[PDB]
Amino acid sequence: QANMGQFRAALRRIMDDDDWVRFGGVLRTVRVKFYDARPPDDVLQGLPFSYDTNERGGLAYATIKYATETTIFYLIYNVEFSNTPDSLVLINPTYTMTKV
Amino acid sequence: QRPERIKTTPYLEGDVLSSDSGPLLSVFALQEIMQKVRQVQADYMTATREVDFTVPDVQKILDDIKALAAEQVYKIVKVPSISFRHIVMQSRDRVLRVDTYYEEMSQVGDVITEDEPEKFYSTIIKKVRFIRGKGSFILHDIPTRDHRGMEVAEPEVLGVEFKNVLPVLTAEHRAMIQNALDGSIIENGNVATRDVDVFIGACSEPVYRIYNRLQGYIEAVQLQELRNSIGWLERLGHRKRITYSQEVLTDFRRQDTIWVLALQLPVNPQVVWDVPRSSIANLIMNIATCLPTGEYIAPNPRISSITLTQRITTTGPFAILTGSTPTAQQLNDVRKIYLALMFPGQIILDLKIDPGERMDPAVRMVAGVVGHLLFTAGGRFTNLTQNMARQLDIALNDYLLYMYNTRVQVNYGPTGEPLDFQIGRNQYDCNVFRADFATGTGYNGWATIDVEYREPAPYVHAQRYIRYCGIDSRELINPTTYGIGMTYHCYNEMLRMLVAAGKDSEAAYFRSMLPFHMVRFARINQIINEDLHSVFSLPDDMFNALLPDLIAGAHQNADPVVLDVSWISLWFAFNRSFEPTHRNEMLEVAPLIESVYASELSVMKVDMRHLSLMQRRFPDVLIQARPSHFWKAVLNDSPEAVKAVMNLSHSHNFINIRDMMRWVMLPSLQPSLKLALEEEAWAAANDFEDLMLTDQVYMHRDMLPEPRLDDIERFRQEGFYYTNMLEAPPEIDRVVQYTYEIARLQANMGQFRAALRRIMDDDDWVRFGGVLRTVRVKFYDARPPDDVLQGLPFSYDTIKYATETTIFYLIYNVEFSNTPDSLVLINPTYTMTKVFINKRIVERVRVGQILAVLNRRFVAYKGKMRIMDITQSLKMGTKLAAPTV
């Protein structure tokens, strides 16, 4: 798909159809984390792969890797008496892209 | 990281004795070859021609071959060269149109003479190369202009020069020329997304052929050919087990890039192996380009002796030999032995004899045993000559019959040959250890399959697999038997015979050392099968024919190289193992070198093949010719690195004309862009009127015209001129044909001039056909010297039949102060020589036909385009995103 230049489009189409993707079949080291506030974007939006392209001597090259680690996190919701009934609702959702 | 080198037990751990590599060994082998011939010709009286047997620098030669692949045979220009120019006379409406191509063509090369065929061949070669060079160009970013809503081309790109004509023309003619110039349009110029510029211009036919061929080659050779070459490179890399990076090559192409690929990487091996007397050079190149670097490893000391207590230790049978150290000469002999082992059939060994050497007698007797286990002596190939096999058999005979312990029973046979006896109480028969090259008994090939065939190889001419001692390289990863089960037939029989002869300590030593020996031969098998695979490998049929030709004593086109070693070098080589550590530095760039060499060889062969027909096409020019003449003429105009590669073993001093002619008629060739352009140039050059050479030279008596100047202006408007160019050949009923032989016979008998005079008084013609002649063109605005008007087609040395002839055009200029009969003389001025060319080199045209030469279609790339050369990208270690099948 990178040879035909359709890897990103195929992944976007699969994500928009509400499907699931599994990259390979290698064992992955698992980490466990605990949070009480919104996690950093590395944990939430981090993709399990890397895709780079380079142009050298009139020819185009591509490199693809799969991540060897994954993490499991637990998010604790803390509220105060000053919060409003709509204090947590956003106009657009916040996306997370990993399930174990 | 290689699993073959992982060691789990200390058995295969040894000290590092020395190290060696490929670039060292190639020079070493060349020096050892040349020193032998030097010494042999020094010792005995020899009658031969002088040859200096020097050794060249292989590394610089390889570097020059690499640099040869970066040179281009095309160039990029903005405008084409001018093909037509004009000469303005006193007339206001008539000019002379001159095709320049013939004008620069007549000045290229030397003057043709019968007495020097080599210079004739050189002149033809220079003319053909000039034709090829003149036409290999690409147009890019031409200048244009807007005109009444469309695009037109500038007058400077049209390829014709006419600016000197404009001032003399009238207003109507100037307007007509301007309109005709403005009519030169750019094809579909109002399209914004255009990619090329198309227009009509002027060019000569031989140049236009090359231009079209280059344009077509650029159009056709693209992505798919690159994919095929990279796929073959991947197959070779899988054969050689290289490591790949993670990035891969994608088929994406930018829409402003034009690729140029001038070499196709799969090489025909027949081109390389058809070069006469080139086996040694191919062997040297294989060593220099493919052999890895590594170390020499000694066996573990614990194998020979064991200690039970502090003061109690077992003694070894070869303590004096295992304690010795080699000298420089003995190390060189060990290197020779390993070189012979790594190239089966191509290098064989013999015995060196030095009367000044003093050594213990036991060394030869031990080497007798060692040589049987170390070498293969028949069946399919051999590592050694029949004489050395005989000497080893005699040494083994002497070793077995020397009983320093209690004696054993010996029963001799009737025949007096060595090893003709039974030994021991079980009466072991020692006749099986005498050499027999037909069956291979007594050596490593005894009852063993040495050569195997498997799935097809990346190089189509070398399919064999070598399996010394019957062990596979896979046995180091996935064994077949236990640790005590590793054995083969010859070693087992040798152990049995050693036991039967009463030599138990030696048998125990060899039984301990057997796994080390088999692992060494597994490493050698891997090196041969993986690292050394190249186009410089010997073809299968020659390899198969090596041994029967040696047995029968027949002539060999691939005669093996013979090297001489000493006795103790065999023992030193038995106690070592070569373990590669790094791969050759030139492994990834070798196929490009091979392709460049093959393409240059093909170009040379094509040139020589085209020159070889000249004598049959013109016998009277090349009476004193030889094939060696065009051979030397072609090699005088070839790259130096290719000649250096061909002349590694000084074969250029010893090939005869039969070898030259048999090479010329071989059909194998290697395609390339340079070959295509050269063949197109030769196709253009098949017509010899395009080389400004002809044999349509006539004599006839004519006088220079003397016109009447009754009206100065009316005469000026004519554009009067005179020339010796003929419009048509003269009638056959008035031409007397002469040949070189008849003319020279009549000249020796002293009656040629009378015959010519008699013919001339009859107003007839004489043709001096049969020999090609050099032709020059000159222009004159005044009365020329008597050298050219009275230039005869021959000269007196005996005569010379050929002599360069001048085609002259004489333009008549008159002034207003000229009397109406001023040019009339009392006696005529004669001219004799006329030429027919059948080309329109010079033509008188009206000013309305100035732009009638615009009849060639040119395709030019726009300034946004980029032209890149991708030939350097052909390297072994790259991977495709979508592999080719």
Q: Rounded CA gap, B768 and B306, in Å?
A: 99
The tokens for A90 are 């956003």
Identify all chain A residues contacting B871, using CB atoms and an 8 Å cutoff. none
**B630 φ/ψ angles, rounded to the nearest 5 degrees:** -75, -25
The tokens for B625 are 């010719």
H or E, element range at B522: helix B504-526
Q: Rounded CA gap, B658 and B307, in Å?
A: 70
Cβ–Cβ under 8 Å, residues B452 and B467 = yes
Under an 8 A CB cutoff, do A58 and B249 touch?
Answer: no
Residue B420's Cβ-count burial label (10 Å; 0-12, 13-18, 19+) is: middle
Q: To probe the interface with A, which of B229, B233, B252, B868 has the most A CB atoms within 10 Å?
A: B252
If we measure between CA atoms, which residue out of B149, B155, B153 comes closest to residue B141?
B153
Q: How many helices (H) and strands (E) does chain B have?
A: 27, 32
Under an 8 A CB cutoff, do A62 and B259 touch?
Answer: no
Q: B875: distance to nearest CA of chain A, Å?
A: 13
Q: List the single residue in B251, B868, B872 with the smallest CB-CB distance to A3.
A: B251
Cβ–Cβ under 8 Å, residues B636 and B609 = no
Q: To probe the interface with B, which of A8, A51, A61 has the most B CB atoms within 10 Å?
A: A61
H, E, C per residue of B441-467: ECCCCCCCCCEEECCCCCCCCCCEEEC
Identify all chain B residues contacting A57, using CB atoms and an 8 Å cutoff. 868, 870, 872-873
Secondary structure class of B874 (helix, strand, coil): coil
Under an 8 A CB cutoff, do A57 and B881 touch?
Answer: no
CA distances from B688 to B122, B127, B693, B808, B809 (A): 15, 11, 6, 21, 23
Secondary structure class of B429 (helix, strand, coil): strand
The tokens for A82 are 């000053």
Cβ–Cβ under 8 Å, residues B151 and B199 = no
The tokens for B66 are 């690499």
Q: Rounded CA gap, B68 and B645, in Å?
A: 13
Q: Rounded CA gap, B883 and B879, in Å?
A: 8
Quote the strand ranges of B16-129, DSSP E.
Answer: 16-20, 75-77, 84-88, 94-99
The tokens for B214 are 């280059």
Under an 8 A CB cutoff, do B870 and A59 touch?
Answer: yes
If we measure between CA atoms, which residue out of B337, B347, B242, B376 comes closest to residue B284?
B347
Length of chain B: 885
DSSP B184-199: -BPTTTT-TT--EEEE
A63 touches B: beta carbon within 8 Å:
yes
Q: Rounded CA gap, B383 and B466, in Å?
A: 13
The tokens for A18 are 């509400």
H or E, element range at B694: strand B693-694
Cβ–Cβ under 8 Å, residues B290 and B283 = no
Chain mean position to CA B260 = 22
Strands B561-565 and B347-351 come out as parallel
Q: Which residues pair with B775 in a beta bridge?
A: B805
Cβ–Cβ under 8 Å, residues A84 and A45 = no
If we measure between CA atoms, which residue out of B857, B851, B852, B854 comes closest to residue B163?
B851
A5 touches B: beta carbon within 8 Å:
yes
Q: List the single residue in B252, B870, B882 with the smallest CB-CB distance to A60.
A: B252
Cβ–Cβ under 8 Å, residues B771 and B620 = yes
Under an 8 A CB cutoff, do B246 and A59 touch?
Answer: no
Q: List the single residue in A2, A57, A65 with the smallest CB-CB distance to B881.
A: A2
Q: Rounded CA gap, B120 and B109, in Å?
A: 9
CB atoms within 10 A of CB B767: 19
Across the A/B interface, how many CB contacts are shorter than 8 Å?
A: 39
Strands A69-75 and A29-35 come out as parallel
Contacts of B776 (CB under 8 A, 6+ apart): B106, B107, B804, B805, B806, B807
Q: Rounded CA gap, B575 and B513, in Å?
A: 9
CA distances from B681 to B134, B618, B672 (A): 10, 20, 14
Under an 8 A CB cutoff, do A57 and B250 touch?
Answer: no
CA distances from B520 to B335, B342, B445 (A): 15, 12, 16
CB atoms within 10 A of CB B158: 25
Q: B65: distance to nearest CA of chain A, Å?
A: 22
Cβ–Cβ under 8 Å, residues B467 and B525 = yes
Q: How many CA atoms lie within 13 A of B826 on its CB side?
A: 0
Q: Rounded CA gap, B435 and B390, in Å?
A: 7
If we measure between CA atoms, which residue out of B366, B423, B425, B362 comes closest to residue B396?
B366
Angle between helices B590-611 and B627-635 (to 10 degrees): 140
Q: Rounded CA gap, B828 and B819, in Å?
A: 19
A62 touches B: beta carbon within 8 Å:
yes
Length of chain A: 100
If we measure between CA atoms, which residue out of B404, B409, B374 comes closest to residue B389?
B374
Q: List the single residue in B246, B252, B259 with the smallest CB-CB distance to A5.
A: B252
CB atoms within 10 A of CB B788: 18
Identify all chain A residues contacting B872, using CB atoms and an 8 Å cutoff. 57
DSSP A29-66: EEEEEEESSPPPHHHHH--SEEEEEEEETTEEEEEEEE
Handedness of CA B215, B216, B217, B219 (dihedral sign): positive
A3 touches B: beta carbon within 8 Å:
yes
Residue A9's Cβ-count burial label (10 Å; 0-12, 13-18, 19+) is: exposed
**B18 φ/ψ angles, rounded to the nearest 5 degrees:** -160, 180
The tokens for B761 are 């008084």
Quote the strand ranges of B2-141, DSSP E.
Answer: 16-20, 75-77, 84-88, 94-99, 137-139
Q: Rounded CA gap, B713 and B815, in Å?
A: 9
Q: Rounded CA gap, B740 and B729, in Å?
A: 21
Q: Which residues pair with B20 in a beta bridge?
A: B294
Under an 8 A CB cutoff, do A2 and B872 touch?
Answer: no
Cβ contacts of B398-401, under 8 Å, gap ≥ 24: B398/B364, B398/B365, B398/B368, B399/B365, B399/B366, B399/B368, B399/B369, B400/B430, B400/B497, B400/B501
Under an 8 A CB cutoff, do B250 and A62 touch?
Answer: yes
Q: How many CA atoms lie within 13 A of B82 on its CB side?
A: 14
Q: Rounded CA gap, B303 and B512, in Å?
A: 7
H or E, element range at B856: strand B856-861
If we measure between CA atoms, which residue out of B837, B832, B733 comes closest to residue B775?
B837
Q: List the single residue in B250, B868, B872 with the smallest CB-CB distance to A2.
A: B250
How was this structure obtained?
cryo-EM
CB atoms within 10 A of CB B482: 7
If we measure between CA atoms, which residue out of B700, B713, B699 comes closest to residue B92?
B713
Looking at this protein, which amino acid is placed at residue B503? K
Q: Which residues of B touch A (CB under 8 A)?
A: 246-252, 257, 259, 868, 870, 872-873, 881-882
Tokens 């040139």, located at residue: B607
Secondary structure class of B842 (helix, strand, coil): strand
Q: Is A84 left (phi over 0), alpha (psi -120 to 50) or beta?
A: beta
A53 touches B: beta carbon within 8 Å:
yes
Angle at B32 between CA B29 and CA B36, to 5 degrees: 145
Q: Rounded CA gap, B848 and B845, in Å?
A: 8
The tokens for B733 are 């009923």
Under an 8 A CB cutoff, do B248 and A60 touch?
Answer: no
Identify all chain B residues contacting A49, using CB atoms and an 8 Å cutoff. none
Contacts of B68 (CB under 8 A, 6+ apart): B596, B600, B639, B641, B642
Q: Rounded CA gap, B5 and B884, in Å?
A: 33
Q: B77: distance to nearest CA of chain A, Å?
A: 21
B873 → chain A, closest CA residue: A57
Q: What is the largest CA-CA distance in chain B?
A: 137
Under an 8 A CB cutoff, do A3 and B881 touch?
Answer: yes
Secondary structure class of A99 (helix, strand, coil): coil
If we measure between CA atoms, which residue out of B780, B744, B607 comes closest to residue B685?
B607
